[PDB]
Design a protein around this nucleic acid. Structure first.
Length: 48
DNA sequence: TTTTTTTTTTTTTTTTTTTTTTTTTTTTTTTTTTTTTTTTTTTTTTTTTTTTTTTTTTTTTTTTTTTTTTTTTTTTTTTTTTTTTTTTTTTTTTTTTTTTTTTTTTTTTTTTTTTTTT
């Protein structure tokens, strides 16, 4: 689990995750919840 | 009139030093070889309407393992000190300007003499 990239909030806006093999997706920053450090996974995409 | 003392430059040739001819090592320089940029056209790739059957998200409910959690003791973090490097004031040296002071060299042309080589 190599950390690919970090992005701040900035403002209410749309995140766009992507994939190696032509995978492209968009989502709103309101969806992913927040918590303290040293935590687990929030499934962002359907990989593999 | 004969004979006696002292002084130096030469017979000097050898020791010391200097001068003058030499050729190993790091810094230049010309060559070939590999990275860049602009056109033709060319099959080839690629942009954009229409239809279509698809396959993943959103009604609703479930749980469990990652999110809660408190606490011991480490160990990375910070503090002081000192060394190494970077960078900028300071100083020194050198060059150019225009009137002055000084100098120094390379060749033709002919004819005669020295001065080496064969």
């Amino acid at each position: 689990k190599v950390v690919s990239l970090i992005v701040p909030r900035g403002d209410g806006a749309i995140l766009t995750a992507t994939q190696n093999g032509y995978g492209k997706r968009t989502a709103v920053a309101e969806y992913p919840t927040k918590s303290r450090a040293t935590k687990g996974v929030i499934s962002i995409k359907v990989t593999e």
